[PDB]
Design a protein around this ligand. Sequence first.
Ligand code: GSH
Ligand code: GSH
Lengths: 218, 218
Amino acid sequence: SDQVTLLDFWPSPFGMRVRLALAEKGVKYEYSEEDLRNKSALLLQMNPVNKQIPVLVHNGKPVCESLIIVQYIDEVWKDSAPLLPSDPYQRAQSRFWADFVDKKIYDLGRKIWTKKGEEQEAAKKDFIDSLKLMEGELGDKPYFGGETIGYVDIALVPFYSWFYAYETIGNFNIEAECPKMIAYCKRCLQKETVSKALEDPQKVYDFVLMLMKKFGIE
Amino acid sequence: SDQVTLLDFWPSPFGMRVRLALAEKGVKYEYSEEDLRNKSALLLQMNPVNKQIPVLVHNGKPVCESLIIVQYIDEVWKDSAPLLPSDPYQRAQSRFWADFVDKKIYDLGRKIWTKKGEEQEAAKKDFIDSLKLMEGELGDKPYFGGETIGYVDIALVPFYSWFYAYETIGNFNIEAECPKMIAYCKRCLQKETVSKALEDPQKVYDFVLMLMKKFGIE
Ligand SMILES: N[C@@H](CCC(=O)N[C@@H](CS)C(=O)NCC(=O)O)C(=O)O
Ligand SMILES: N[C@@H](CCC(=O)N[C@@H](CS)C(=O)NCC(=O)O)C(=O)O
């Protein structure tokens, strides 16, 4: 009976998080591709402050910010396995590592393709170091969520679709430095929800090339 | 029966958030002042990744990141009014605006005292604009949480203790531009939990002066 619309833009790893969370919890929804150059009345109505995607509109009410949206989904749709742990301590740990993806993985990945020379080299090193910290957190578990896809998996795994772009522009190989991280991503990709939610790495790379041309930083 | 320790550093608005949340929910705890130049074994044990305060140690388990800690406190101690709304939509809105404090209020406030000239002027303008957006969200309610101190109040109000420093270094007057925000802060300060948790603005300013001397940016 519920009305669910996702305002999104295809190459966004932030949008991919929400696509994955909706799929993982079996939520039926309408996907709406936004033109971010000419933002729709709906996007402006629903996210007046940030004017960004993704935005989830559920029964006429908007939820903004990808990680906030994933938590909302977890709290609202309950007829599947939880994405966040029920134990408060474990839940706080999951929040810590999901945030870490925003603060380190996204930020440093962005520096890899937007910067050059020594600054870019530093970003690559810090990016790899950050993935290594996540490998440590994963430990011997198959997923960050344990035996199923959890909040941290949803936060992180969409960035795999950007790895080829980071590697090609930055000139490095993540599998060589972080084989456990890559094994983990490939394991996640065996799942239909993950493979359907994540975009093609070649297409994402071509999108980043378009941005580099736009900003004159090839 | 529970063991609670807060690792903190007195002028930190992030630590003040946790001090306030613990007070608001009536949690007994031991406050531990950290020297961030010579970090203690305990801090290094409890926050190996970020090595930052605040850290809440509850029954031997660490919780890091101020907003994550406040949510943890809300989920664990239940014999007082909730800090976050029970309705998922309202809860997502509260998370949005608490995050906004980190992303705009803290960030822009920092630029006001660390930058000069035109860059500093831009930071002041954006800071005021951000407070105005929060005034709009407050609307006609006495607190962001409605009729009691909520998550967003805890996220925001500690920054009032830094306002005098921003105003003095940046040369502007927040009350003149944002009378509603200042009325709100003063209203919060009528509460014992808020007044006891927030530090003296003169002392905070003197701390910032120490930092400006340290970095040679007076
Ligand atoms: N912190 C946000 C980031 C969202 C974001 O960066 N969205 C971009 C697209 S990937 C956007 O809509 N940008 C607006 C613009 O470029 O005008 C989240 O997690 O949802
Ligand atoms: N995002 C963190 C920020 C905490 C933070 O910035 N902490 C500072 C003190 S205010 C710290 O411990 N700094 C470590 C250092 O300077 O080495 C939070 O919200 O808790």
